[PDB]
Amino acid sequence: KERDMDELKKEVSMDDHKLSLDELHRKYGTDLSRGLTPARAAEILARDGPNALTPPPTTPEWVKFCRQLFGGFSMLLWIGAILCFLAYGIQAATEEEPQNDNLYLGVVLSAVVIITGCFSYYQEAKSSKIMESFKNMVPQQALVIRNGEKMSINAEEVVVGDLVEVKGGDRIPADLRIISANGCKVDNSSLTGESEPQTRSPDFTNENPLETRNIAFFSTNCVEGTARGIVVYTGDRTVMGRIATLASGLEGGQTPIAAEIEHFIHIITGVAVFLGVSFFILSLILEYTWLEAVIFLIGIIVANVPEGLLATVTVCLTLTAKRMARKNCLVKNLEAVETLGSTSTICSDKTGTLTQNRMTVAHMWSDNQIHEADTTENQSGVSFDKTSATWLALSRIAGLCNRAVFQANQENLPILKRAVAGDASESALLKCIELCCGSVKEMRERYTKIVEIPFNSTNKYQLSIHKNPNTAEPRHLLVMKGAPERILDRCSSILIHGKEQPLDEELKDAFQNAYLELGGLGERVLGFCHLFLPDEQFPEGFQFDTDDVNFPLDNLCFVGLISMIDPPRAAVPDAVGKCRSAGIKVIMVTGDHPITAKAIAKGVGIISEGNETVEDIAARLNIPVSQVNPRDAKACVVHGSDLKDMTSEQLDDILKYHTEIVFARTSPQQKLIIVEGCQRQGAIVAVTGDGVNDSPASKKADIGVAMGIAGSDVSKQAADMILLDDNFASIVTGVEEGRLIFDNLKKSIAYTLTSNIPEITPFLIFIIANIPLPLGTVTILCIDLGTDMVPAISLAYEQAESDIMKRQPRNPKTDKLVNEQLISMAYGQIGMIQALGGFFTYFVILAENGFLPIHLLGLRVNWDDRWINDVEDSYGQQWTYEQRKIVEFTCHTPFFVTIVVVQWADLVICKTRRNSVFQQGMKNKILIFGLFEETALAAFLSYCPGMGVALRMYPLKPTWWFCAFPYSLLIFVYDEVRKLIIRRRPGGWVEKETYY
Amino acid sequence: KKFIWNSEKKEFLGRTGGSWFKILLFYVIFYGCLAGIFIGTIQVMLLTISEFKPTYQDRVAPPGLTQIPQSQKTEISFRPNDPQSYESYVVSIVRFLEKYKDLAQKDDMIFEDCGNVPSELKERGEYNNERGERKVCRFRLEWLGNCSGLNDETYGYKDGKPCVIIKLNRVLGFKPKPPKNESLETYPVMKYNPYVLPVHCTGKRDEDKEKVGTMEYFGLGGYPGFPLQYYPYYGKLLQPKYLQPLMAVQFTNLTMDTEIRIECKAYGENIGYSEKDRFQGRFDVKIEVKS
Amino acid sequence: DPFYYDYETVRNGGLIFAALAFIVGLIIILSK
Ligand SMILES: *[C@@H]1O[C@H](CO)[C@@H](O[C@@H]2O[C@H](CO)[C@@H](O)[C@H](O)[C@H]2NC(C)=O)[C@H](O)[C@H]1NC(C)=O
Ligand SMILES: CC(C)CCC[C@@H](C)[C@H]1CC[C@H]2[C@@H]3CC=C4C[C@@H](O)CC[C@]4(C)[C@H]3CC[C@]12C
Ligand SMILES: CC(C)CCC[C@@H](C)[C@H]1CC[C@H]2[C@@H]3CC=C4C[C@@H](O)CC[C@]4(C)[C@H]3CC[C@]12C
Ligand SMILES: *[C@@H]1O[C@H](CO)[C@@H](O)[C@H](O)[C@H]1NC(C)=O
Ligand SMILES: [Mg+2]
Ligand SMILES: [Mg+2]
Numbered sequence A: 001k002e003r004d005m006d007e008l009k010k011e012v013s014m015d016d017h018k019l020s021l022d023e024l025h026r027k028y029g030t031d032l033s034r035g036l037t038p039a040r041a042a043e044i045l046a047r048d049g050p051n052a053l054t055p056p057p058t059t060p061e062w063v064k065f066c067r068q069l070f071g072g073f074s075m076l077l078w079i080g081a082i083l084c085f086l087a088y089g090i091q092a093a094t095e096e097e098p099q100n101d102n103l104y105l106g107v108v109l110s111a112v113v114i115i116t117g118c119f120s121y122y123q124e125a126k127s128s129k130i131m132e133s134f135k136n137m138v139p140q141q142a143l144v145i146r147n148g149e150k151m152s153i154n155a156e157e158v159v160v161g162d163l164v165e166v167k168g169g170d171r172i173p174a175d176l177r178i179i180s181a182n183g184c185k186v187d188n189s190s191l192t193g194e195s196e197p198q199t200r201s202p203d204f205t206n207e208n209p210l211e212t213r214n215i216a217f218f219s220t221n222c223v224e225g226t227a228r229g230i231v232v233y234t235g236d237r238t239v240m241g242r243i244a245t246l247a248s249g250l251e252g253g254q255t256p257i258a259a260e261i262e263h264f265i266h267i268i269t270g271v272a273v274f275l276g277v278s279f280f281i282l283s284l285i286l287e288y289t290w291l292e293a294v295i296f297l298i299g300i301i302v303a304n305v306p307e308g309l310l311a312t313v314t315v316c317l318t319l320t321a322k323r324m325a326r327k328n329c330l331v332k333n334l335e336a337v338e339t340l341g342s343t344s345t346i347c348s349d350k351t352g353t354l355t356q357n358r359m360t361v362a363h364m365w366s367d368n369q370i371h372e373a374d375t376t377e378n379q380s381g382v383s384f385d386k387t388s389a390t391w392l393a394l395s396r397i398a399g400l401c402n403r404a405v406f407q408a409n410q411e412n413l414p415i416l417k418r419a420v421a422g423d424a425s426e427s428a429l430l431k432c433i434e435l436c437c438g439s440v441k442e443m444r445e446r447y448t449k450i451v452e453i454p455f456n457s458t459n460k461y462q463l464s465i466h467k468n469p470n471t472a473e474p475r476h477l478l479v480m481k482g483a484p485e486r487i488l489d490r491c492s493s494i495l496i497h498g499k500e501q502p503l504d505e506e507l508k509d510a511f512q513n514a515y516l517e518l519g520g521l522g523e524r525v526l527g528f529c530h531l532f533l534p535d536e537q538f539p540e541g542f543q544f545d546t547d548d549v550n551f552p553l554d555n556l557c558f559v560g561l562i563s564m565i566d567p568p569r570a571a572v573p574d575a576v577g578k579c580r581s582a583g584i585k586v587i588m589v590t591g592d593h594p595i596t597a598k599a600i601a602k603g604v605g606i607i608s609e610g611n612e613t614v615e616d617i618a619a620r621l622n623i624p625v626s627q628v629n630p631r632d633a634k635a636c637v638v639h640g641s642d643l644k645d646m647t648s649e650q651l652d653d654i655l656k657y658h659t660e661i662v663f664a665r666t667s668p669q670q671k672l673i674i675v676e677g678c679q680r681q682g683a684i685v686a687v688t689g690d691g692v693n694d695s696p697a698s699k700k701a702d703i704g705v706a707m708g709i710a711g712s713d714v715s716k717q718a719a720d721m722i723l724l725d726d727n728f729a730s731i732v733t734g735v736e737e738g739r740l741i742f743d744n745l746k747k748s749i750a751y752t753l754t755s756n757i758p759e760i761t762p763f764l765i766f767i768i769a770n771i772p773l774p775l776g777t778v779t780i781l782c783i784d785l786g787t788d789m790v791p792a793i794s795l796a797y798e799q800a801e802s803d804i805m806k807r808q809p810r811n812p813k814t815d816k817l818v819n820e821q822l823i824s825m826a827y828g829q830i831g832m833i834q835a836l837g838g839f840f841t842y843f844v845i846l847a848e849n850g851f852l853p854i855h856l857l858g859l860r861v862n863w864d865d866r867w868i869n870d871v872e873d874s875y876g877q878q879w880t881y882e883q884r885k886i887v888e889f890t891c892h893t894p895f896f897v898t899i900v901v902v903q904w905a906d907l908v909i910c911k912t913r914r915n916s917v918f919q920q921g922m923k924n925k926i927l928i929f930g931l932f933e934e935t936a937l938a939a940f941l942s943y944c945p946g947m948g949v950a951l952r953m954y955p956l957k958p959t960w961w962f963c964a965f966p967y968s969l970l971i972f973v974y975d976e977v978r979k980l981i982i983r984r985r986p987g988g989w990v991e992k993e994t995y996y
Numbered sequence B: 001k002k003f004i005w006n007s008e009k010k011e012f013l014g015r016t017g018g019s020w021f022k023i024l025l026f027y028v029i030f031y032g033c034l035a036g037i038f039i040g041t042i043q044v045m046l047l048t049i050s051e052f053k054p055t056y057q058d059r060v061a062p063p064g065l066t067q068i069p070q071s072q073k074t075e076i077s078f079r080p081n082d083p084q085s086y087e088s089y090v091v092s093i094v095r096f097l098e099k100y101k102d103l104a105q106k107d108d109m110i111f112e113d114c115g116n117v118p119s120e121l122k123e124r125g126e127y128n129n130e131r132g133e134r135k136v137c138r139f140r141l142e143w144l145g146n147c148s149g150l151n152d153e154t155y156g157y158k159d160g161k162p163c164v165i166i167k168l169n170r171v172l173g174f175k176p177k178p179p180k181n182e183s184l185e186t187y188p189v190m191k192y193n194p195y196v197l198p199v200h201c202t203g204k205r206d207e208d209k210e211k212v213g214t215m216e217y218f219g220l221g222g223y224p225g226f227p228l229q230y231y232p233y234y235g236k237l238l239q240p241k242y243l244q245p246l247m248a249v250q251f252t253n254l255t256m257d258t259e260i261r262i263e264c265k266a267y268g269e270n271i272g273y274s275e276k277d278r279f280q281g282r283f284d285v286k287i288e289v290k291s
Numbered sequence C: 001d002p003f004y005y006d007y008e009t010v011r012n013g014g015l016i017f018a019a020l021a022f023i024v025g026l027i028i029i030l031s032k
């Protein structure tokens, strides 16, 4: 019945927050000011469990080893080894003194699977080890009030229903029910997604237990203020606890690359069994027995299975994954490296993923001119204008009239990424003055403060009077800030270009429109003003008041405005643009208010200029929204409140008829619903998130992208790709590498599949025409597990033949990895020429030793006989068993060399799919080493002392190396003119048949 | 999932009709060109080698030593009474010596009577075709005494005590060179050393050597070997119907109902041996006359 | 005699070729 539990966790949460202070203490039975007795703690601590999420499920060491030992590709190899042993069992009960060919092949295939599993386990283990070295979380104890006495105890020792006091700076231990606050602004970033710090008020505000202010949530830090509250939920029963457990109970699904590997195995078996059955009928129709026909069938199917392709594909993916690890784009799933390349819809998160999740000064108004401050994280943006005297006034008001500054260790850390104590606005002002006006350490003390007035609920004002600096002698400076509409009313003088002017409505309304411009831009504006108290009417020494306000509240001099918002990350806009360039549909999925989401969407690229929503057209026409046609609006903002009352069919209509969609105020569960809706269309989805609200979205999606530092641990574990540097451009790099490795995979696969023709054909005609074996098994192993390993691997270092970031994402049902065209090229054309080249060397060698090609017909009968030592050649000479057998082995070795010779041209032609070898160039240093090492190794396998005794690979007469040269040159010329016709004639036939 | 049979677009086995014709036509032209190219290359290769000499003869450096009864495992197990038990042997001997009868060697335009005494090598010029078809020296079955063919006693060689003739692997241009002074193995079996290649049989261990009672050899004029007047060989083209020398070996006092091993080693300078090829130079037999 | 092949010379030449072709490939891959 777990299918119902998962749905219960998918359902939105509910609460009991809306209860009187007498009703809340009644349901749990707790004192409102003294909490509960210490004995009462052990009554709930050992009852339901300590206040801590249940650790994730553990999958022991040997499980991954066995997982890689089985797989799907390893499954094809296991069935091959099983068929080898079955063929050996069928051959043992029949022939006098059998051979150990099938036995060696079976043990070899098994070792291949084991070796690949070990290498894969090593790579996947290294990934988890570095992730563990990055996830070091320390305990955070809670300040609980028990028995009327304050006590700081571990978070796991907290129970349900005991007064907890959270100070400005502490993290909310468990889900609390606020009862008394003092301007507390909890940071609900990781849970709900609300960028701007939300204040917590003891009084019930919204029906939704999230939007309400009388609830503190788990894993949320108290930005400022202090508050009291009763514990409602604990451990896994918390909001984020249920979200994390839901993430742990979701299905990962089938990756797009594994489906391609499976489809590949499918065609492999297609040809394997087709050739085995057709040759089984042919073998019987000729003269063989059922006993030998079964052995043949098994040998044809097994010899048609690319053994060495497993290690090549594994290392091929590992190389591209290592290039991601070098750039901090770690991948926990070895096959998730390609997933980006097939993505066609990226569902991103706003707060944390696209933005920096840091309230920062965006724009300032001074001298009737908006000034956009650089909103970058690394300080690489255009610098604002600072030459006027008004900038100094604004900088003074902001740097002076501000409660706190940085902390103790915040000395070596950068100005932006360093911690600051206080409200989120004050920190932004501090960073703007520290980056634009020098420092604030000596600037704040240089202007000694006397009487400071903090924010008030009535007559809302935030001011402070300070002493005057360097000899100018105006003696006093009264700074004040606040709501623009409130500070404007308490001002008469206005600073402009350096001097002062009256409050004429002409420029006052110029300030009003500047307020609405920065408001509609998606920012939070604040007005700043100051006044010089004339020291002639008011004393120079001690003259102040605080109860019966003496400082002139009005007649102040307004300087300007200072807006602020969490800005998007540096490379985010360009990244979104690049993704839209490749054809990826960018969809924003956030939990923040729509007012901010729309502005951020228009600023990063999710919403381009010109495209209007269903609301923008109605506002442009002064008509109700219900009138306009939704087809006229290209983009649209989907409110989470309306998504709750939506069906499965309507979501599809929203995704199809709208290109730029922005889902706002969406609960984590709603994010999962959206991801499922995008997957219903049949397109590949990639979710990029950071908070725990993105865990169910990053888990279900084909690939989850979490932030290495700005991302919570839950969503970081439920994801499949980690961005250690948080550089959102890694998404663009990932999609590029995905498509690149997909094409190089096609090439490497074709290179390994082409060698099976000149590999199987010798044994095939050995049975057909009854001629001596042209190619042995040892040599074949030296080919697929020897020479061709390096070229197949070096084919992964190839680079783009065109602009891969310009083409559309691949279609899962149309553009397959291994289609029929690849089979027509490898098994049909190229492999055929390689086989003819092999037989040429065969006849050349045998004919030069006296056994003319014509005389070899039907000679196998007496050739494999160990006792007929008078075998006559075409010249009349009598050859013993070992003599003609030495010729057979010294005829097998050059066949292997012939394979290497034709593989030179095969590697060069498989290096490019459309372009010419000269347009692309053999700049792949690994590919060149692949040819030198291949040739050297082959020559060693024949001229090494003791090879005719160890592997029965005798040395070759030098003149044999040139036997396959014309065939290789022919392969090169033919495929070259083929790609040239595809280049100059991108029409039909030459494109629908050869192009793989 | 296998209903690829047909479609509304006239598809058979996967594609249309015109598509099948285009692909089949391409494959016919392509594979035909490939076959023609392979044939042209194999033709040039056939032009590379000559007709009177193989371009490589190092793989047959130490000549072999075969026998008349090509046994399944070089073992001769039969019954001295049952004629069908040794039929497989006798038939192989008769067909082998069927080309050595006096009636088979009757034309004097292709046969040359060498002599009743082993003589020096007979070199018939070079291996070119400037000369006519070379002559082949006669070798009558009478030379193999008591192991002759069909002359007076078509004994079948088994009324007890069998016969096993040995033959030197015919090699083109091979000039056998018998031994001399350094003789740590050349037994005094027969006087003639200079114009005959000696071959001596023996047991294999302290057991076989005792079980094998007596061996009697028969050759040209009574010499246990091969006469040098029959070498060298000039190929099948220049010397058709050639008859290499033969040498018979009879084992008289054997141990009936006992499998014993015999090793017939041919000695000479141009005769090499091999621990991997039990036939190169030497020869082995597992005889057992079970009554 | 024509029944003798200097296999030692060809074998040595093959080993020399393998060594040279391998170090050359190393130079191309470990290029500087
Ligand atoms: C050729 O055949 C005759 C048979 O007519 C052999 O006669 C042998 O005579 C010797 C001498 O007394 C006996 O020791 C043997 O037992 C006889 N053998 C047989 C099979 O009867 C004669 O040895 C044979 N060989 C030669 C060289 O004459
Ligand atoms: C249409 C034209 C260009 C094709 C002409 C085919 C040429 C290039 C082919 C045809 C026969 C071939 C030769 C056939 C015989 C030999 C001797 C052999 O032991 C090694 C290969 C070698 C040395 C070949 C080299 C290439 C060759 C000369
Ligand atoms: C880019 C292409 C054309 C380069 C082709 C490389 C040619 C020139 C090289 C590659 C491998 C070489 C062969 C490698 C092995 C042997 C056996 C050795 O004991 C003597 C040299 C000999 C017979 C070489 C002849 C030249 C050869 C065939
Ligand atoms: C075999 O017969 C010979 C005849 O001369 C005799 O000398 C020898 O001792 C016998 N050996 C055995 C083992 O019977
Ligand atoms: Mg293979
Ligand atoms: Mg987030």
Ligand SMILES: [Mg+2]
Residues within 6 Å of the ligand: A252, A698, A699, A700, A701, A702, A703, A704, A718, A719, A720
């Ligand atoms: Mg996943």
